[PDB]
Design a protein around this ligand. Structure first.
Ligand SMILES: *[C@@H]1O[C@H](CO)[C@@H](O[C@@H]2O[C@H](CO)[C@@H](O[C@@H]3O[C@H](CO[C@H]4O[C@H](CO)[C@@H](O)[C@H](O)[C@@H]4O)[C@@H](O)[C@H](O[C@H]4O[C@H](CO)[C@@H](O)[C@H](O)[C@@H]4O)[C@@H]3O)[C@H](O)[C@H]2NC(C)=O)[C@H](O)[C@H]1NC(C)=O
Ligand SMILES: *[C@@H]1O[C@H](CO)[C@@H](O[C@@H]2O[C@H](CO)[C@@H](O[C@@H]3O[C@H](CO[C@H]4O[C@H](CO)[C@@H](O)[C@H](O)[C@@H]4O)[C@@H](O)[C@H](O[C@H]4O[C@H](CO)[C@@H](O)[C@H](O)[C@@H]4O)[C@@H]3O)[C@H](O)[C@H]2NC(C)=O)[C@H](O)[C@H]1NC(C)=O
Ligand SMILES: *[C@@H]1O[C@H](CO)[C@@H](O[C@@H]2O[C@H](CO)[C@@H](O[C@@H]3O[C@H](CO[C@H]4O[C@H](CO)[C@@H](O)[C@H](O)[C@@H]4O)[C@@H](O)[C@H](O[C@H]4O[C@H](CO)[C@@H](O)[C@H](O)[C@@H]4O)[C@@H]3O)[C@H](O)[C@H]2NC(C)=O)[C@H](O)[C@H]1NC(C)=O
Ligand SMILES: *[C@@H]1O[C@H](CO)[C@@H](O[C@@H]2O[C@H](CO)[C@@H](O[C@@H]3O[C@H](CO[C@H]4O[C@H](CO)[C@@H](O)[C@H](O)[C@@H]4O)[C@@H](O)[C@H](O[C@H]4O[C@H](CO)[C@@H](O)[C@H](O)[C@@H]4O)[C@@H]3O)[C@H](O)[C@H]2NC(C)=O)[C@H](O)[C@H]1NC(C)=O
Ligand SMILES: *[C@@H]1O[C@H](CO)[C@@H](O[C@@H]2O[C@H](CO)[C@@H](O[C@@H]3O[C@H](CO[C@H]4O[C@H](CO)[C@@H](O)[C@H](O)[C@@H]4O)[C@@H](O)[C@H](O[C@H]4O[C@H](CO)[C@@H](O)[C@H](O)[C@@H]4O)[C@@H]3O)[C@H](O)[C@H]2NC(C)=O)[C@H](O)[C@H]1NC(C)=O
Ligand SMILES: *[C@@H]1O[C@H](CO)[C@@H](O[C@@H]2O[C@H](CO)[C@@H](O[C@@H]3O[C@H](CO[C@H]4O[C@H](CO)[C@@H](O)[C@H](O)[C@@H]4O)[C@@H](O)[C@H](O[C@H]4O[C@H](CO)[C@@H](O)[C@H](O)[C@@H]4O)[C@@H]3O)[C@H](O)[C@H]2NC(C)=O)[C@H](O)[C@H]1NC(C)=O
Ligand SMILES: *[C@@H]1O[C@H](CO)[C@@H](O[C@@H]2O[C@H](CO)[C@@H](O[C@@H]3O[C@H](CO)[C@@H](O)[C@H](O)[C@@H]3O)[C@H](O)[C@H]2NC(C)=O)[C@H](O)[C@H]1NC(C)=O
Ligand SMILES: *[C@@H]1O[C@H](CO)[C@@H](O[C@@H]2O[C@H](CO)[C@@H](O[C@@H]3O[C@H](CO)[C@@H](O)[C@H](O)[C@@H]3O)[C@H](O)[C@H]2NC(C)=O)[C@H](O)[C@H]1NC(C)=O
Ligand SMILES: *[C@@H]1O[C@H](CO)[C@@H](O[C@@H]2O[C@H](CO)[C@@H](O)[C@H](O)[C@H]2NC(C)=O)[C@H](O)[C@H]1NC(C)=O
Ligand SMILES: *[C@@H]1O[C@H](CO)[C@@H](O[C@@H]2O[C@H](CO)[C@@H](O)[C@H](O)[C@H]2NC(C)=O)[C@H](O)[C@H]1NC(C)=O
Ligand SMILES: *[C@@H]1O[C@H](CO)[C@@H](O[C@@H]2O[C@H](CO)[C@@H](O)[C@H](O)[C@H]2NC(C)=O)[C@H](O)[C@H]1NC(C)=O
Ligand SMILES: *[C@@H]1O[C@H](CO)[C@@H](O[C@@H]2O[C@H](CO)[C@@H](O)[C@H](O)[C@H]2NC(C)=O)[C@H](O)[C@H]1NC(C)=O
Ligand code: NAG
Ligand code: NAG
Ligand code: NAG
Ligand code: NAG
Ligand code: NAG
Ligand code: NAG
Lengths: 188, 133, 188, 133, 188, 133
């Protein structure tokens, strides 16, 4: 770009693959569905969704009270990594385990082959503004605008799925996630 | 000053920025380019095992600046997404300015005209500092 | 003010009503009594006091173990907001729920029509310096000097009351409270 | 530079500060005036729903500066309570200095004489910078 | 040092004794053994070690679930101070009591006259990277390089011992510890 | 400017640094000397009871700088351990530079030659600023 007779406007574009290859990253398919990836070469991922349908009921499923690792089947090959990524998500959500609603996860004898962690963000289940707090966290984490939208049941759901390149790595989301988990260990 | 490696950039060119431009990095707290440079320098010294990026991410990346850009994005205001940076470069002399961020609205880079006043003054500012020395 | 023949000393005073109308604020009546207001138009408030008399005993009253919302009667109209303000106060105190003494709150069948949350800050009930930690937090939060004073029983009490304009909004206290609760939702 | 609205001030006057004075805001980390300007700018763009003040309060307000002022207040040392700010203004030219805080002791504003040396040098500093340009 | 004909290179060395006399400090005997001192005049200290031998078993010893103060015998003269220093260490380790493995401490009827707090940092006991997280915290806290070394059982052990001048006060370690415990009370 | 007390130093000499050197403290975020000065000032006003060092440690000490130095130490890179600081002092005039940290590798102070380029430019920088005034 020719600004003047002797001055030019130039640009540089950074490539952040090498810096954030081996660290957890996240991506937004749409304003309700998000994906968290432990590392670029992981064959599994965690899906974070805002849903209107209850999938886990308190009458039949376990609640997470300092036993999140039990929500993953003992026969999963990447069980420790999946529990670690769940903790990374939980710390990225800035979850208050003293005051926020107790998360639910699936029963031990579930027929479905996926690990589900459910948070009830319906108005009145938690303290005032808990739904808004979570939605604004989703906006800060994944760049979502779900919060900038108009009493029905609503949940934040974290399930495990196979990595199918549902998005492209976003190093801003990586920075937000890593900032929320500063001091932890990442990079193998 | 600092000359970036090939893998840090997508243009496949040798880009090096003088110490005169890079000296402004400490002075400016709202430079995303400086944070990205700190990140690249840390990863460079890391490449040449345990990864200490989680301990240094606060020292390298300003949380407030990232937060401001995210809030600007959530409100559709032009924001920095830490990818493309523009600078003014005197073609004959080779002197340049500290690369500023190239803002984004609606998942699209801001057109040059849309921040013309940003790169006029900067250009002028360069052409002034050159005459001070 | 005339500094010199051609120079004047001028001042500006800010009005912070519009910025902090809709956010929680706090005020200090005296070095022992403090008031937290959810918003300017709230008809209720939370009183934070440093008292020398035990009001709740461990033998007859409930202890807060991740069930703070139960300390508010289900028939209160602003129950969710009151629980939210209690959490805001608790996060502003920088309370350590793993190590700090367990708070007490009133029994379900209490005759008194107010919700009381009691923290025992008597020396020896908690770890060394817990009383000093809480008193210095009160100084930081409300600008109190209670800490800069001379083994008797002492408690930090949070009760609910009607807003009667017991103080004037203080935007420095508002800033301290909001900084302690950064990322939460405030403003309706 | 920046011209404040009527509702931001109690004097009911049009107060606007030039870019020369406000350029010092980035350089100075101990300015409470710049922090209050950041709050007013954020609230201004918010007024013109969800309120994002909790996410931006760290970027707008320096926690360390607020903490220092609170600790100064607890020890009865003169402190800033973020309400009244003084500046030096050349009456004829209209050039002014960056408004500094008006300190408080014993729930009372510090008298002008009690910080006379503060507003002498500043005045002199202004009268020096004017001659540099 | 004579830089030139009219310029000299001079140095100053600071003495940080008076600033950090009355605050908790820590020192590193070697890359596995560390000592935490409540204050310079304390006759007792806390030893933090990385060991390969299990000392407390889950089958016979108590686990720390919000009752750390119970790990100290009620007849110890500095019981409150020791519990306070334990909390300072725990906050300095950036311990996540929701997700990190539950610490073990000795039984009430232990014959040994020392209070032991054990954390299992063996790979697979906790989430992925927990051992690396703890070892890098030890590096940040005490300046240790234990993390920069090569599946056997490994534990982080905190015991109480008599102060025998095992090290010299290090004000950088003091700063790291105090930064991890900002807002608490220290200095009598 | 600031004259340190006897108990703050181990040399048993009257050391005072002018306001010209100390004015750079606000500008520089990577000065450990300025942080140690802030600690000594706070402890000085504390000595002349409750100790408020835990509340002010974030305002006085930069967490990012301490973290960077610790990470440099863990990787055997030269680091600041906040103990010894070197400055350049014009013997005749008495004008000096802001004391920079004396780096350490392998539990031993870096030799003067090993940072010769550090104290040449600084010396030169001083000899330049002296001529600007
Ligand atoms: C994380 O850890 C928590 C505990 O901290 C686990 O939650 C517990 O889950 C167990 C079983 O999974 C529950 O135990 C069941 O309790 C019933 C009665 O509980 C009363 O009290 C609790 C309050 O604690 C109320 O929530 C509940 O409504 C009742 O009022 C019993 O009916 C159950 O009996 C079952 O077992 C017996 C054999 O022992 C069988 O005969 C029965 O048919 C039946 O299967 C059972 O004892 C316990 O209530 C839960 N506690 C809480 C606080 O919720 C989570 O499961 C765990 N999560 C993970 C992921 O590991
Ligand atoms: C998302 O997360 C979920 C749970 O967190 C994972 O789903 C689990 O996946 C594991 C495998 O990793 C499944 O475990 C395997 O199940 C097989 C069949 O299970 C039956 O087990 C008995 C058999 O009668 C009955 O209860 C019932 O019929 C079950 O259907 C077994 O064949 C497997 O065992 C084999 O391997 C093990 C380990 O090598 C050997 O010890 C055995 O001998 C045998 O060879 C194994 O147990 C588990 O069932 C799944 N959970 C559920 C709830 O169904 C997802 O895989 C995970 N996805 C991703 C991408 O991470
Ligand atoms: C938040 O949640 C906590 C639990 O996490 C609640 O605290 C519990 O409160 C219940 C009742 O409110 C208590 O249950 C009572 O326990 C007595 C025996 O408890 C022994 O063990 C506990 C240790 O857990 C000791 O503290 C206690 O001293 C005893 O050694 C029983 O005597 C009680 O019987 C009552 O109910 C029966 C009917 O079931 C009646 O017949 C009796 O007359 C009597 O009314 C009762 O079971 C429980 O002990 C408390 N736990 C703890 C850990 O303190 C809080 O109340 C709750 N707070 C809020 C605000 O919701
Ligand atoms: C500070 O916080 C406290 C508690 O956190 C609040 O005090 C409670 O206030 C609520 C109202 O918001 C009270 O609930 C009402 O009580 C009335 C009388 O209670 C009696 O209930 C039965 C009747 O026999 C007995 O247990 C006993 O005699 C009680 O005294 C009822 O008339 C009310 O019910 C009416 O309204 C409800 C809801 O609309 C209807 O469903 C009913 O049909 C009926 O019309 C109601 O239950 C409660 O009693 C108070 N608590 C206590 C412990 O006394 C304060 O109000 C709060 N203050 C502020 C400023 O926030
Ligand atoms: C901090 O607080 C925790 C609780 O929050 C304490 O941990 C408890 O410790 C007590 C005793 O110290 C344990 O109680 C014992 O439980 C046994 C059965 O427990 C079953 O369930 C638990 C799950 O909660 C499982 O861990 C366990 O394996 C069992 O499945 C009983 O066998 C024990 O009986 C003992 O007492 C009776 C008299 O009452 C005697 O007749 C017996 O011989 C025997 O001595 C006993 O009741 C309890 O299980 C522990 N809970 C947990 C969750 O671990 C910590 O001790 C405490 N720590 C400190 C430092 O204070
Ligand atoms: C590191 O931390 C540990 C524990 O956290 C401390 O070890 C404990 O130290 C205390 C003293 O501070 C010991 O308590 C004393 O024990 C003596 C003997 O204990 C016996 O008690 C009965 C007697 O039959 C039996 O259970 C058994 O034989 C025990 O061996 C008693 O003589 C002491 O009592 C005396 O003093 C008390 C208080 O003044 C009086 O009330 C009594 O009348 C009497 O005069 C006292 O109980 C305790 O035993 C130790 N723990 C263990 C597990 O052995 C370390 O001291 C601590 N170290 C540091 C440097 O901090
Ligand atoms: C998630 O939280 C929501 C919000 O609290 C829960 O839904 C609520 O469930 C309660 C009962 O558990 C419902 O109350 C019932 O309301 C009807 C009136 O329509 C009445 O017939 C019943 O007697 C009772 O009062 C409440 O209406 C309902 N709220 C909504 C918006 O549907 C939900 O159960 C929670 N789910 C999980 C999995 O935690
Ligand atoms: C708040 O914490 C204080 C401080 O621990 C508690 O008061 C203390 O209560 C214990 C008993 O629970 C008292 O011990 C008793 O002391 C007397 C000696 O005077 C003796 O006769 C008894 O055998 C027993 O040892 C202790 O003295 C007392 N402390 C004070 C300063 O009074 C208080 O109970 C706690 N209250 C609540 C509501 O949590
Ligand atoms: C940023 O600079 C790049 C060069 O690094 C510009 O891309 C070149 O643009 C010219 C002129 O249109 C083309 O002839 C070249 O083929 C382009 N090269 C490449 C590698 O893309 C690019 O236009 C600039 N981007 C802006 C201004 O947004
Ligand atoms: C920064 O924003 C630009 C868009 O302005 C993004 O560039 C796009 O990247 C996607 C892949 O993620 C490509 O498909 C598009 O073609 C790119 N567009 C342009 C105009 O180059 C860029 O990815 C964004 N970076 C971040 C970290 O969000
Ligand atoms: C800052 O301090 C001044 C006092 O120096 C406060 O001004 C007083 O405000 C109260 C109402 O809160 C009035 O009744 C007084 O008349 C005012 N005094 C003066 C001298 O103007 C001011 O409120 C303080 N602001 C904060 C946020 O603490
Ligand atoms: C900073 O590093 C120096 C070493 O370069 C340390 O100085 C040593 O201090 C010990 C006592 O702790 C003495 O035994 C040595 O003789 C000293 N060596 C030298 C060369 O002076 C100094 O203690 C370190 N400070 C900190 C806080 O780590
Ligand atoms: C944003 O940009 C897209 C891209 O073309 C455009 O379609 C859309 O209308 C713009 N505005 C909004 C509010 O989405
Ligand atoms: C983008 O801006 C440039 C100015 O260089 C202009 O030529 C171009 O038409 C603009 N693109 C669109 C889509 O408006
Ligand atoms: C503080 O100022 C008040 C206001 O007049 C005065 O009465 C008081 O004596 C002063 N000093 C103290 C220590 O309160
Ligand atoms: C406050 O200072 C002014 C200086 O302008 C002086 O005139 C006035 O008397 C002082 N007030 C008091 C109460 O000392
Ligand atoms: C570090 O310095 C010590 C001190 O003499 C020396 O013995 C050692 O070889 C050096 N290198 C390493 C890697 O320890
Ligand atoms: C340290 O550096 C000085 C330069 O002043 C040199 O004389 C000395 O020999 C060096 N020491 C060692 C052990 O190399």
């Amino acid at each position: 770009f020719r600004i003047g007779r002797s001055t030019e406007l130039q640009n540089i574009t950074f490539d952040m693959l090498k810096v954030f290859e081996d660290h957890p990253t996240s991506c937004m398919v749409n304003h309700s569905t998000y994906y968290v990836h432990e590392n670029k070469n992981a064959t599994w991922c965690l899906e974070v969704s805002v849903t209107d349908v209850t999938l886990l009921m308190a009458e039949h499923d376990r609640q997470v009270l300092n036993n999140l690792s039990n929500c993953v089947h003992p026969a999963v090959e990447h069980r420790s990594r999946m529990v670690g990524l769940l903790e990374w998500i939980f710390r990225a959500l800035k979850y208050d385990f003293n005051h926020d609603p107790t998360p639910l996860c699936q029963k031990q004898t579930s027929t479905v082959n996926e690990t589900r962690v459910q948070i009830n963000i319906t108005e009145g289940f938690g303290s005032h503004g808990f739904e808004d707090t979570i939605l604004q966290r989703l906006g800060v984490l994944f760049g979502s605008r779900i919060a900038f939208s108009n009493g029905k049941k609503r949940f934040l759901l974290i399930r495990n799925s196979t990595w199918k390149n549902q998005c492209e790595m976003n190093h801003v989301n990586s920075m937000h996630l890593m900032l929320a988990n500063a001091g932890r260990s990442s990079g193998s | 000053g600092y000359c970036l490696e090939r893998w840090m950039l997508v243009t496949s060119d040798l880009k090096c920025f003088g110490n005169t431009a890079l000296a402004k990095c400490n002075l400016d707290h709202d430079s995303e380019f400086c944070d990205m440079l700190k990140l690249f320098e840390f990863n460079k010294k890391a490449i040449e095992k345990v990864n200490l990026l989680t301990h240094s991410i606060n020292a390298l990346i300003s949380d407030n600046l990232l937060m401001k850009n995210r809030l600007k994005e959530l409100l559709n205001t032009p924001y920095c997404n830490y990818t493309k940076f523009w600078y003014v470069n005197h073609t004959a002399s080779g002197e340049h300015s500290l690369p500023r961020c190239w803002l984004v609205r609606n998942n699209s880079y801001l057109n040059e005209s849309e921040f013309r006043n940003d790169w006029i003054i900067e250009s002028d500012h360069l052409l002034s500092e050159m005459l001070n020395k």
